[PDB]
Amino acid sequence: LFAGTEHRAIMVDSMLHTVYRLSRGRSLTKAQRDVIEDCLMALCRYIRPSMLQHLLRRLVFDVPILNEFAKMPLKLLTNHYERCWKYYCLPTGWANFGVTSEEELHLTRKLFWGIFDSLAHKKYDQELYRMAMPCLCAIAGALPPEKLDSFINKFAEY
Amino acid sequence: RLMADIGGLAPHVIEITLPMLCSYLPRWSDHLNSLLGNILRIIVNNRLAVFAQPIVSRARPELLHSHFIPTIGRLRKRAGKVVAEEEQRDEFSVLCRDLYALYPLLIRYVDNNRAHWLTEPNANAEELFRMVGEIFIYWSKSHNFKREEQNFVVQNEIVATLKKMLPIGLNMCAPTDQDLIMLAKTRYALKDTDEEVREFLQNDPEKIVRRVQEVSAVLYHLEQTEHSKQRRRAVV
Amino acid sequence: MADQLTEEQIAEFKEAFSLFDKDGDGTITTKALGTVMRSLGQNPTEAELQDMINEVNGTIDFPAFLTMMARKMKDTDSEEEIREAFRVFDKDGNGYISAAALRHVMTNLGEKLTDEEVDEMIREAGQVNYEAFVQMMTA
Amino acid sequence: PYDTLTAKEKARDREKAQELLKFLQMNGYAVTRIEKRFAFGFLQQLLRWMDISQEFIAHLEAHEQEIKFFAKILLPLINQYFTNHCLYFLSNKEKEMITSLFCKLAALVRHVVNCLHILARKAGLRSFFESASEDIEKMVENLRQNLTYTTVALLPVLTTLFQHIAQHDVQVSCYRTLCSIYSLRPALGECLARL
Amino acid sequence: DRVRIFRAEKSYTVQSGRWYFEFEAVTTGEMRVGWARPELRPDVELGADELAYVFNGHRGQRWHLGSEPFGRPWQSGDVVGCMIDLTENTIIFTLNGEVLMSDSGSETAFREIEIGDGFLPVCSLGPGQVGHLNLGQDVSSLRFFAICGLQEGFEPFAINMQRPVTTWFSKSLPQFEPVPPEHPHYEVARM
């Protein structure tokens, strides 16, 4: 029902960002964390990436750096890339939504750069190869003085 | 040259002449048509079926009409013999599966020839279409043959044969009135003989009645082919 | 059920509760219960301990501790049942039980399942994979 | 971060700095201190990863966890990128990176299977063809497990050569390989037909 | 300016049976060949809405409530045709006497279409494009109908029409029309 929200895009984006912040909280149960992660993944899959740009920027700000609750960023990235592959990969974009934003594309590219750099730098692990590696593969597939004092006083007067 | 010698010889050396024939074909008129006819004859004389025709690139319909017609007749005779043997166990099912597996290359070649020769439906094309329709009807008559064909297709990684024969039946020529054809189809729905078709035609007439009955049987065969959590907890 | 754990496990839990509740009144403090659980190898996190206490003066009696541990015992039993459902097809070694194999397994189960019930279960979900069988059993 | 920050949040400080620069200019003070670019950077990173993988293979022939993680990650990522943008690559830095990756794969074969198959799908090509012909001749002589691995690599190499020929020194090596095949079961015939 | 939509009169709509017509492309270009519903709006593009079923003759795509690739583009001098069976509600296109396969190999471009009010032939022509339309008035006129569709039971639109089929052409000259009572974004109230 909430998929493709446009009338209240700001409200749903703020709600998604706050839910993402809640999912990263340090006071939660394992079942609660799993339920929150599943709900966030479902919302990200159903909601359009354009309406979730505010949450996407926060997610990709420190996606490779963050290690706690690392399953949620990978799941969100995989869901967004699978649902809206051509929305960012193709120059034309979707038939309905169309092309994406240049700033969003640059942020996604930087996030992918950091992600695969960390994957190359990090040691081999079954969990890493099962969670981060599919996300990296999907991201790769998505790729197509006194005078100074006087000047300071003048600036203060201005 | 090499193709003529391979055709004359036709085998243990088949695995060697096949690479040379494939290399000659990929490099790329009358010589190509003759080589294709010789390859088809060698395949008919004889995994092996797949290697016989890895790819189809025939472009001359004259050689196809001259050679595939005897090949189509031989395939129809083999299918009839297999059906008779099955009518008269595990060995029969294995033989039917082996025949169906080899038929896949011949079926593909026949379909390609029909597509190429669809512009000019000559008498040889009509005879080939009639033979293909008879073979398809015989295959659909016995469910064991269809099961063996499906098993062979699954292993190699009936429905395909029927789809291929459908264009042949569509390209076939039938009387405009088709009253005899309709009567023959109605009789076939009741599993009757061809006497009803002849009576309807009366009400080369015999040849026309036989062709109408065959077309009606093929159409009928094609139409038939087209047509609690507590328990889970206890199991766990 | 409170008796989900084995007899040896129940005896060990009772001994741990008695050691924690040395006063003999049965009531054991939350810190004492956590220390006893850690000594027995069932060291839970602070959030997990709080959730277990909420599910089950400031003290918890030995029967209360047994009831709280019964939830973890039931969770372990459910995990074992899920593993058994997943490995039922892998027992033969193929990993993908065929239709005949699935029907034979359903008949061997004998959980009041008839031909119609087996057909409905197969349709709900042609070889049946181990993962597919586990998903169907989970429902 | 500067790139991760919102447009307006950084733009406020950008406007403040622009006002400061305008004030400095008014005072006369002078202060002195991307799809193609992304593709070029990715190509350079792929070349560096191939070099690192070759170095790790050489070391293992005679740290390790990081090398294994890179080999498991980049190779599937490279395969996915190739599957996604084969048309883009076919239609420069990318060509040089592809050639370097092919050379590294050939060197590794001479010294994963899915990654090599995905990668397969001038002087270097002629050398590879000559090496494949020599390996085939050696395997034929031995028949009458390096030979099996060489034949397996040549089969994907034969498929890659057939695909390149369909899309489009080396001639002498190809003629020698064809003559050797003609002189010398079904796999050999399929390879000869593809070549 | 805009493409002139060419269609038959509303009295010629068909609700059942099998009908086939052939279009000859004298000059290559973007041709929208197919049939559309009687409620055809000339303002919108051909196939843009859900009331048309046409196939683009230059981009190799099928137009029905969007664009979906199908078939292959033709060249100058190559005729095109559309044969439709309403009993099965399947849409098949014919190019140069050959059935165009879809992406998945299906011989039909569209399937499972409600009969609705009916279907009538519609053609489009681009700027400077020249094409020849044959509705099947003469059996000898239809050249490729014998090759494909003759033995399939399909019949031309004008099997027994003594008079030529009347056609309606889109007029580029604007004409004033009364306000629709349910305009999507316009409303007039007479207080």
PDB file of C-alpha atoms in Angstrom, chain D residues 91-181:
ATOM      1  CA  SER D  91      31.130  -1.025 -28.452  1.00  0.00           C
ATOM      2  CA  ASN D  92      41.101   2.723 -24.500  1.00  0.00           C
ATOM      3  CA  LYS D  93      41.671   2.061 -20.801  1.00  0.00           C
ATOM      4  CA  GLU D  94      38.934  -0.588 -20.727  1.00  0.00           C
ATOM      5  CA  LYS D  95      40.491  -2.469 -23.653  1.00  0.00           C
ATOM      6  CA  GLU D  96      43.927  -2.373 -22.010  1.00  0.00           C
ATOM      7  CA  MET D  97      42.466  -3.653 -18.734  1.00  0.00           C
ATOM      8  CA  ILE D  98      40.645  -6.451 -20.574  1.00  0.00           C
ATOM      9  CA  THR D  99      43.864  -7.441 -22.352  1.00  0.00           C
ATOM     10  CA  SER D 100      45.775  -7.419 -19.055  1.00  0.00           C
ATOM     11  CA  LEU D 101      43.097  -9.568 -17.402  1.00  0.00           C
ATOM     12  CA  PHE D 102      43.185 -12.025 -20.312  1.00  0.00           C
ATOM     13  CA  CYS D 103      46.984 -12.225 -20.092  1.00  0.00           C
ATOM     14  CA  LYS D 104      46.799 -12.818 -16.332  1.00  0.00           C
ATOM     15  CA  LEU D 105      44.193 -15.552 -16.823  1.00  0.00           C
ATOM     16  CA  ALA D 106      46.345 -17.214 -19.492  1.00  0.00           C
ATOM     17  CA  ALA D 107      49.386 -17.072 -17.201  1.00  0.00           C
ATOM     18  CA  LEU D 108      47.381 -18.583 -14.334  1.00  0.00           C
ATOM     19  CA  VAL D 109      46.094 -21.355 -16.612  1.00  0.00           C
ATOM     20  CA  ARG D 110      49.632 -22.102 -17.810  1.00  0.00           C
ATOM     21  CA  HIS D 111      50.909 -22.261 -14.220  1.00  0.00           C
ATOM     22  CA  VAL D 112      37.927 -20.049 -10.558  1.00  0.00           C
ATOM     23  CA  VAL D 113      36.548 -22.077 -13.464  1.00  0.00           C
ATOM     24  CA  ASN D 114      33.399 -19.942 -13.653  1.00  0.00           C
ATOM     25  CA  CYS D 115      35.438 -16.728 -13.483  1.00  0.00           C
ATOM     26  CA  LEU D 116      37.747 -17.938 -16.261  1.00  0.00           C
ATOM     27  CA  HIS D 117      34.772 -18.951 -18.416  1.00  0.00           C
ATOM     28  CA  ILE D 118      33.137 -15.548 -17.886  1.00  0.00           C
ATOM     29  CA  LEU D 119      36.393 -13.757 -18.730  1.00  0.00           C
ATOM     30  CA  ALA D 120      36.752 -15.814 -21.916  1.00  0.00           C
ATOM     31  CA  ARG D 121      33.168 -14.997 -22.931  1.00  0.00           C
ATOM     32  CA  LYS D 122      48.092  -9.464 -31.382  1.00  0.00           C
ATOM     33  CA  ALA D 123      51.341 -10.889 -30.015  1.00  0.00           C
ATOM     34  CA  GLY D 124      49.631 -12.144 -26.860  1.00  0.00           C
ATOM     35  CA  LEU D 125      46.910 -13.942 -28.812  1.00  0.00           C
ATOM     36  CA  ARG D 126      49.503 -15.573 -31.076  1.00  0.00           C
ATOM     37  CA  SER D 127      51.548 -16.684 -28.060  1.00  0.00           C
ATOM     38  CA  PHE D 128      48.436 -18.110 -26.386  1.00  0.00           C
ATOM     39  CA  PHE D 129      47.477 -19.990 -29.558  1.00  0.00           C
ATOM     40  CA  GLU D 130      51.005 -21.390 -29.906  1.00  0.00           C
ATOM     41  CA  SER D 131      50.999 -22.495 -26.260  1.00  0.00           C
ATOM     42  CA  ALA D 132      47.598 -24.156 -26.704  1.00  0.00           C
ATOM     43  CA  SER D 133      48.807 -25.973 -29.828  1.00  0.00           C
ATOM     44  CA  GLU D 134      51.955 -27.152 -28.032  1.00  0.00           C
ATOM     45  CA  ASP D 135      49.895 -28.369 -25.067  1.00  0.00           C
ATOM     46  CA  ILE D 136      47.506 -30.220 -27.390  1.00  0.00           C
ATOM     47  CA  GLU D 137      50.435 -31.866 -29.183  1.00  0.00           C
ATOM     48  CA  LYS D 138      52.013 -32.879 -25.866  1.00  0.00           C
ATOM     49  CA  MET D 139      48.712 -34.335 -24.637  1.00  0.00           C
ATOM     50  CA  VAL D 140      48.277 -36.269 -27.893  1.00  0.00           C
ATOM     51  CA  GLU D 141      51.820 -37.640 -27.618  1.00  0.00           C
ATOM     52  CA  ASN D 142      51.306 -38.632 -23.974  1.00  0.00           C
ATOM     53  CA  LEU D 143      47.969 -40.332 -24.695  1.00  0.00           C
ATOM     54  CA  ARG D 144      49.544 -42.634 -27.295  1.00  0.00           C
ATOM     55  CA  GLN D 145      47.478 -33.959 -14.916  1.00  0.00           C
ATOM     56  CA  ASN D 146      48.799 -30.802 -16.568  1.00  0.00           C
ATOM     57  CA  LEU D 147      47.623 -31.951 -20.011  1.00  0.00           C
ATOM     58  CA  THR D 148      43.993 -32.224 -18.881  1.00  0.00           C
ATOM     59  CA  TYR D 149      44.059 -28.739 -17.345  1.00  0.00           C
ATOM     60  CA  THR D 150      45.706 -27.338 -20.481  1.00  0.00           C
ATOM     61  CA  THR D 151      43.024 -28.923 -22.678  1.00  0.00           C
ATOM     62  CA  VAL D 152      40.265 -27.592 -20.407  1.00  0.00           C
ATOM     63  CA  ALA D 153      41.745 -24.088 -20.598  1.00  0.00           C
ATOM     64  CA  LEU D 154      42.132 -24.363 -24.382  1.00  0.00           C
ATOM     65  CA  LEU D 155      38.472 -25.349 -24.759  1.00  0.00           C
ATOM     66  CA  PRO D 156      37.345 -22.089 -23.091  1.00  0.00           C
ATOM     67  CA  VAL D 157      40.118 -20.392 -25.074  1.00  0.00           C
ATOM     68  CA  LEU D 158      38.744 -21.979 -28.252  1.00  0.00           C
ATOM     69  CA  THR D 159      35.254 -20.725 -27.380  1.00  0.00           C
ATOM     70  CA  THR D 160      36.631 -17.228 -26.740  1.00  0.00           C
ATOM     71  CA  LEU D 161      38.489 -17.282 -30.066  1.00  0.00           C
ATOM     72  CA  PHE D 162      35.330 -18.391 -31.882  1.00  0.00           C
ATOM     73  CA  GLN D 163      33.331 -15.609 -30.214  1.00  0.00           C
ATOM     74  CA  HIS D 164      35.983 -13.039 -31.157  1.00  0.00           C
ATOM     75  CA  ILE D 165      36.016 -14.283 -34.763  1.00  0.00           C
ATOM     76  CA  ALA D 166      32.219 -14.053 -34.918  1.00  0.00           C
ATOM     77  CA  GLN D 167      32.312 -10.523 -33.483  1.00  0.00           C
ATOM     78  CA  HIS D 168      35.105  -9.500 -35.871  1.00  0.00           C
ATOM     79  CA  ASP D 169      51.577 -14.000 -36.036  1.00  0.00           C
ATOM     80  CA  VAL D 170      48.132 -15.166 -34.932  1.00  0.00           C
ATOM     81  CA  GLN D 171      47.389 -16.550 -38.403  1.00  0.00           C
ATOM     82  CA  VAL D 172      50.486 -18.777 -38.372  1.00  0.00           C
ATOM     83  CA  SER D 173      49.623 -20.153 -34.927  1.00  0.00           C
ATOM     84  CA  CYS D 174      46.019 -20.787 -35.988  1.00  0.00           C
ATOM     85  CA  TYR D 175      47.187 -22.602 -39.127  1.00  0.00           C
ATOM     86  CA  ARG D 176      49.608 -24.722 -37.088  1.00  0.00           C
ATOM     87  CA  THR D 177      46.858 -25.607 -34.604  1.00  0.00           C
ATOM     88  CA  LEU D 178      44.480 -26.523 -37.436  1.00  0.00           C
ATOM     89  CA  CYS D 179      47.141 -28.715 -39.061  1.00  0.00           C
ATOM     90  CA  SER D 180      47.842 -30.435 -35.734  1.00  0.00           C
ATOM     91  CA  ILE D 181      44.119 -31.048 -35.187  1.00  0.00           C
TER      92      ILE D 181
END
